[PDB]
């Protein structure tokens, strides 16, 4: 394993945070 | 407690993906 699963979900979460941040500041 | 975290992140990631989808075109 469950720790590996959380690691993968967090890695994905951080990638999506930064992508939204880039897209928010860009259009807004 | 770990499986609780998995569900928490799934929902968070889903909402983030929905923002990415909208804020792309818009």
């Amino acid at each position, epitope marked *: 394993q469950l*720790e*590996d699963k*959380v*690691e*993968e979900l*967090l*890695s*994905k979460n*951080y*990638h999506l945070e*930064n*992508e939204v*941040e*880039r897209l928010k*500041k860009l259009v807004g | *407690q*770990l499986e609780d*975290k998995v569900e928490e992140l799934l929902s968070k990631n889903y909402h983030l993906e929905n923002e990415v989808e909208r804020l792309k075109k818009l």
Partner: nanobody
Amino acid sequence: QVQLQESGGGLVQAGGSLRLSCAASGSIFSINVMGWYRQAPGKQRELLASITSRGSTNYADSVKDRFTISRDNAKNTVYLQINSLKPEDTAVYYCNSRGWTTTRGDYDYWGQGTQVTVSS
């Protein structure tokens, strides 16, 4: 607690390449994501690449085939190979250590970064 120190940057001709190093001090937690970001002056910070404890990697699409993240075979050190550098790649490159633990919750630690300056 965790403390990171980047190195390997500096001045470089366009067309060159660098291996940046992030040396990690302190506890290596069981849930951890090491990431490389960069920030140009004025611009927003940009996640380039991530690696988990088990070696699973995650790249920003724009650099997936030019930059490569990896971990030393033995040392508590992660690397970012940045190839085919162009003036647009000038920035401070930062390392970060991020995750969650059943005991203390979310954590997030930043290096101070290494400046890369690509000249032409």
